[PDB]
């Protein structure tokens, strides 16, 4: 088995907006992986934003983002969210989707270098 992570949504957007943009998972067993969020914007390096371990389980929030981004996962559909609410131009970047096998790693998990496959990024601009 391998992973394939396929990202949709993006585009450009004035402040106090919203977006949501999904992260499609093929494969076996999306339950056995750890859901994140990271953020990469002009010039800086790479930022943890969310993640999620499983459906009845409370999610790993950044600071700079929470009570604005929430994680949820669809597993009918087997499709990971984030919904951007009231947006900043401070959340301008590229949005990348990861996974990350549960065995042998650990909860919560905001190191990059440990997550195991890669969505291809998705382009979110926000501006006044």
Do not use: H
């Not at 990271?38 to 993640?51: I, L, N, T, Y």
């Not at 009918?76 to 949005?95: F, H, I, R």
């Amino acid at each position: 088995g391998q992973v394939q992570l396929v990202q949709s949504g993006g585009g450009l957007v004035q402040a106090g907006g919203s977006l949501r943009l999904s992260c499609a998972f093929s494969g076996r067993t999306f339950s056995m992986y750890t859901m994140g969020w990271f953020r990469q914007a002009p010039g800086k390096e790479r930022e943890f934003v969310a993640a999620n371990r499983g459906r009845g389980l409370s999610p790993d929030i950044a600071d700079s983002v929470n009570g604005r981004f929430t994680i949820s996962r669809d597993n009918a559909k087997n499709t990971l969210y984030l919904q951007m609410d009231s947006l900043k131009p401070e959340d301008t970047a590229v949005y990348y989707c990861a996974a990350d096998l549960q065995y042998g790693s650990s909860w919560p998990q905001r190191s990059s270098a440990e997550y195991d496959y890669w969505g291809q990024g998705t382009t979110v601009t926000v501006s006044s």
